[PDB]
Every structure is written in structure tokens, then in C-alpha cells.
């Protein structure tokens, strides 16, 4: 579970494990795929997707997911998590605002991202309905058995941990997690690399002038922009994405039927939608003479139909056609 710098972490820029990168309000189904720097899913070892492992300290905390909250302008709905990554059904929102509850603390993370949800169709809803026609939307999956893409996930760079740099009663005293690789020296001249167990520091004294580092590359990370490079190498760790964008047919929009009214080679149409509906036509002469107008306000319109025919498209309701001799 990677940890990075959340931008407006409740107060201001903290370093949250759930630091939000790559917000994708690019689908249609009320859904956003998000990456936390935290890797929830199974535990550290082997069990139960519905548990929760973020970083506390240098360490993980692979425990229950109890009170996740993604949210935006309104509280979102989770869809599924896998890896670093969560899918959640959100409404539109100027921002994105994520957070669980460990239990002692709220411990959330928030971010800017322009979000919208147009459904696919000539109706510009704000939200998916219960009914209407199905038609080919873009949307992310529920599932994990997924390989359609993979993002590079090589090592972490080092990280700071000044909990290490204690004092040896006059000298600044570094320690190690588990024998991990601590990269160490101070502004003064003393040990210059640091690949060690718990060292002391002969020369410097102040904690604030030393290299508290953790080369702990036993587990790779996501290659966040808010990661410091592991300077050594491009290690392996090519790793999939679960939530591929797929060609789901969203349960989708439908605009109320029109009121057809006859006139001489002319369609008066008293019209009354639910939401802004893009109407348009095609006078089937080799003179096309089409028309487009989003209609949200109910409006009686007109169409000079010709002899050979016109067609009529009340939103994603199917196209009509008309003989006006």
C-alpha cells in the first residue's frame, strides 16, 4: 500500500496512504475508477478482497474495510476494489473526496477533478434512470479477472523515517525495520552510504541533519507521480489493471414521446421533455437541411417537411420518419 502526498487532506497537504491519483470521470455510468496509493484487497498475505491494507508507519495495516467513503458533491457508491484501485458510482462533482475510517481517526483524502456523467444518448440527463432503452455506453467492470491493460509497477524509492534517528545518549542513533537497507550519512563527515543494521553516528549529533532513509524494496509500488524514484534501476513488476473500460450497454436514457400534430407539409410538434434532449432531423432531399437543438424547456417547434420525407429523432428514442405529401 503506497503512501503519497494528499493535496487537501482534511486540513491541508498531508501524506495519506489513500492519496488519490488518476481520477477518471471519463465513463458514462455514474462510475469513476480511482487509484488510491493504498492497496486494499486481500490482506498482507492471502485472504478476503473485502479487507483493508493501508500504510501506517513504515508498516501496513491489513484489516477490515469497515467504513470506506468515496464522495464528491454527494456521497458516492462503492462498486468494487482490487489492488490499489477502486471503482465507485459517483454523481458529478467539481472535486473527488475519498476516505475510510480506521476507527480512531477519520483519515481521509481529497482531490480536484472535473467530473460529469453524460449518459450515452441525445438526452443530457444528470443521472441514470430505472428504465429506458439500452445502448452502447462506456463503463468499467465489476470484476478483477482482468488483463486488458497493465501499468508499470516497479519498486519504491526510499522514504523518510525520522523515528529511526534516535539518540545514543550523545550521538544520533539510526535503527532498522527488520534488517532493511537504511541509506545514511549526515551533513558532517561520518558513514557515507548506509547499508547496515542499526548504526550510530560518530560525527553529527542533531537528528535534523541526517539521512533517515528506507530502501525497503521487498514489495514494488504503483509508479505515482508522488513517488520518489528508486534510483538504482527499473525493476520488474508489470501489473495489470482490473477496471478496464468495457462496452457495457448501460441501462440508459429515454425522453417522453412527442405530440405529433399535422399541418400542410409541416410538423407542428408540441414537445415536453424530462431533460435537455438533442433533437435533430434530416430532410431527405439531396438538400439535407438538418437541424440541431438541445431541448430542455418544453417547446412547440416546426419542421417544413418536403414531399419525399423527413426523419425525426426524439432523443435516443428511435428515429421516426414521415410522408408529407
Amino acid at each position, epitope marked *: 500500500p503506497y503512501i503519497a502526498d494528499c493535496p487537501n487532506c482534511g486540513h491541508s497537504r498531508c501524506d495519506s496512504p489513500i492519496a488519490i491519483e488518476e481520477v477518471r470521470g471519463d465513463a458514462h455510468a455514474g462510475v469513476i475508477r480511482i487509484q488510491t496509493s493504498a492497496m486494499f484487497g486481500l490482506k498482507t*498475505d*492471502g*485472504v478476503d478482497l473485502a479487507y483493508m491494507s493501508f500504510m*501506517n*508507519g*513504515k*508498516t501496513q*495495516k*491489513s*484489516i477490515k474495510i469497515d467504513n470506506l467513503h468515496v464522495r464528491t458533491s454527494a456521497p458516492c457508491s462503492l462498486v468494487s476494489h482490487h489492488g490499489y484501485y477502486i471503482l465507485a458510482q459517483c454523481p458529478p462533482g467539481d472535486t473527488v473526496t475519498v476516505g475510510f475510517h480506521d476507527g480512531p481517526n477519520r483519515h481521509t483524502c481529497t482531490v480536484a477533478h472535473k467530473v460529469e456523467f453524460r449518459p450515452v444518448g441525445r438526452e443530457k440527463y444528470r443521472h441514470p434512470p430505472e428504465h429506458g432503452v439500452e445502448l452502447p455506453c462506456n463503463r468499467y467492470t465489476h470484476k478483477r479477472a482482468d488483463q486488458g491493460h497493465y501499468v508499470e509497477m516497479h519498486q519504491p524509492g526510499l522514504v523518510a523515517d525520522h*523515528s529511526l534517528l*534516535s539518540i545514543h545518549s550523545a550521538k544520533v542513533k539510526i*535503527t*532498522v*525495520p*527488520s*534488517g*532493511a537497507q537504511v541509506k545514511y550519512y549526515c551533513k558532517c563527515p561520518d558513514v557515507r552510504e548506509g547499508i547496515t*543494521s*542499526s548504526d550510530h553516528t560518530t560525527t553529527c549529533t542533531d537528528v535534523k541533519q541526517c539521512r533517515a532513509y528506507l530502501i*525497503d524494496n521487498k514489495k514494488w509500488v504503483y509508479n505515482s507521480g508522488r513517488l520518489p524514484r528508486g534510483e538504482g534501476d527499473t525493476f520488474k513488476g508489470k501489473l495489470h489493471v482490473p477496471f478496464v473500460p468495457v462496452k457495457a450497454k448501460c441501462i440508459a436514457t429515454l425522453a417522453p414521446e412527442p405530440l405529433v400534430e399535422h399541418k400542410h407539409r409541416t410538423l407542428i410538434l408540441h414537445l415536453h421533455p424530462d431533460h435537455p434532449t438533442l433533437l435533430t432531423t434530416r430532410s431527405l432531399g439531396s438538400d439535407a437541411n438538418p437541424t440541431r437543438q438541445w431541448i430542455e424547456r418544453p417547446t412547440t417547434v416546426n419542421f417544413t417537411v418536403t414531399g419525399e420525407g423527413l426523419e425525426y429523432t426524439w432523443g435516443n428514442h428511435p428515429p421516426k420518419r414521415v410522408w408529407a405529401q
Partner: antibody, heavy 117, light 110 residues
Framework: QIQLVQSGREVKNPGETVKISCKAS????????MLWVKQAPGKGFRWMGL????????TYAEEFKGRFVFSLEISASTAYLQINNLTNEDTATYFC??????????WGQGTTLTVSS | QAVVTQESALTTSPGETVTLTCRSN?????????ANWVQEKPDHFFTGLIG???NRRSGVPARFSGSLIGDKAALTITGAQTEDEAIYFC?????????FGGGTKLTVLG
């Protein structure tokens, strides 16, 4: 539910080798590795290392890298401790243990070795 | 290369609340030390109580809870019982190995 039952206690003269078995019951062997702990007569409890019952890789505590060798009859849910070229100060009790829940949750009964001519 | 320290012996009476602590020689104990508490009853009988600081093993009475108090890991027995008379050992994780404390002999009236 979970039972780790260990071999019985041996006597061995200095220089010999011993293989102590730990037969696991109640869990899926493979998702939980094994801790080997030495509780020496006076001294108290000490971690000897851990074995990844999935891959098979052992970690030894530095005190134990050398004469000690962890292995497993995977197939029978057994983990084993082998102490070669027994030193007289290895008399003590060795426990197998399951690592789970950010610590150790179950301990075995113990197999006590008395190195003695 | 770290030394876990525990009280040597503690005596309480049935019904009382008693706290055992676990101190690390390198610094404050934190959640990344995953404090474990193990109990040894007579006959070389070991059971795990708490793991990862505050996770109670399954089938361990609720009178047992773990936590971090100050800079150390603590085990509280709330309503100690006669049955709780035993040796309690704490274990701390240090990035690559485990270090066990010396154990606390607890005596409970009964």
C-alpha cells in the same frame, strides 16, 4: 480446529542431528507459514526464524543461521526443524507456531531435546 | 539487536483490572511493531491472545485487550480471573525478525 502436534522429546549425544516434526491441523497449510521458537530452560522465548510454507523459503534468526535448517513435508502439512552437529547448549524446548493476525496465534506442544552423552 | 522488556511478576486478585507492558529498547513501540501477547500455562502450553497490537485471537475471552499506552504495548485483563495466572510474553516485530520479551509471571487470587 487448529492443532500443531509435535514429535516427542529426544535425547542425543553431542555431535548428532535431530529432525523435529510439526504436523499441522485445522488450517490450509499454504496460507500460513511457521515460526520456530526456542525456549531455553532459563533464558525465556526466542524467535529462531520463519518458513514460507508456500514457496518454501526459510528466514533464520542470525543466532540460528548455520546448524539450523527448516524444511517441510508440504504434502502432509508438516514443518520440520533440523539441528545438525548438536551442541550441548542446545538443550531446550522448541515450539512450532502459526504466524497470523500480525503476530503468532497458535503455539504447538513443544519438543524438548536433551543433548547428553 | 533490540531488547523487549516486561514486568517480572505482577500479583492481582480475582475481579481486578491489571496492565502488563512491553517496552522496546530502541524507541516507542508503534503499530508497525505488531505487538503480540502470548500466554504460557503450565505444561509448556502456549496460546496466542493478541496480535497486531489489538487483534484478539479467536476464542480468547474479552477480558483481554491490547493497546499502545505511551510508548509501549500493553495487555489489560479486565476482571482478572484465577485462570489467568500464568506467564505472559510480548513479542515485537522489527522489520525482519521477532524479539520476545522476558515474560511477566502473573499471579491471580483464587
Amino acid at each position: 480446529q487448529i492443532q500443531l502436534v509435535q514429535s516427542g522429546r529426544e535425547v542425543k549425544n553431542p555431535g548428532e542431528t535431530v529432525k523435529i516434526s510439526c504436523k499441522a491441523s485445522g488450517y490450509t497449510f499454504t496460507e500460513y507459514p511457521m515460526l520456530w521458537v526456542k525456549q531455553a530452560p532459563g533464558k525465556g522465548f526466542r524467535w529462531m526464524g520463519l518458513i514460507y510454507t508456500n514457496t518454501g523459503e526459510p528466514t533464520y534468526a542470525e543466532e540460528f543461521k548455520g546448524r539450523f535448517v527448516f524444511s517441510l513435508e508440504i504434502s502432509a502439512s508438516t514443518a520440520y526443524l533440523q539441528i545438525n552437529n548438536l551442541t550441548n547448549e542446545d538443550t531446550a524446548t522448541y515450539f512450532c507456531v502459526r504466524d497470523y493476525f500480525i503476530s503468532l496465534d497458535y503455539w504447538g506442544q513443544g519438543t524438548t531435546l536433551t543433548v547428553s552423552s | 539487536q533490540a531488547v523487549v522488556t516486561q514486568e517480572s511478576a505482577l500479583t492481582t486478585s480475582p475481579g481486578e483490572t491489571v496492565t502488563l507492558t512491553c517496552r522496546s529498547n530502541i524507541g516507542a513501540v508503534t503499530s508497525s511493531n505488531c505487538a503480540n501477547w502470548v500466554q504460557e500455562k503450565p505444561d509448556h502450553f502456549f496460546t496466542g491472545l493478541i496480535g497486531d497490537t489489538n487483534n484478539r485471537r479467536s476464542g480468547v475471552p474479552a477480558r483481554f485487550s491490547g493497546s499502545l499506552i505511551g510508548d509501549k504495548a500493553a495487555l489489560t485483563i479486565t476482571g482478572a480471573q484465577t485462570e489467568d495466572e500464568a506467564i505472559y510474553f510480548c513479542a515485537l516485530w522489527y522489520n525482519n525478525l521477532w524479539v520476545f520479551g522476558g515474560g511477566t509471571k502473573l499471579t491471580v487470587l483464587g
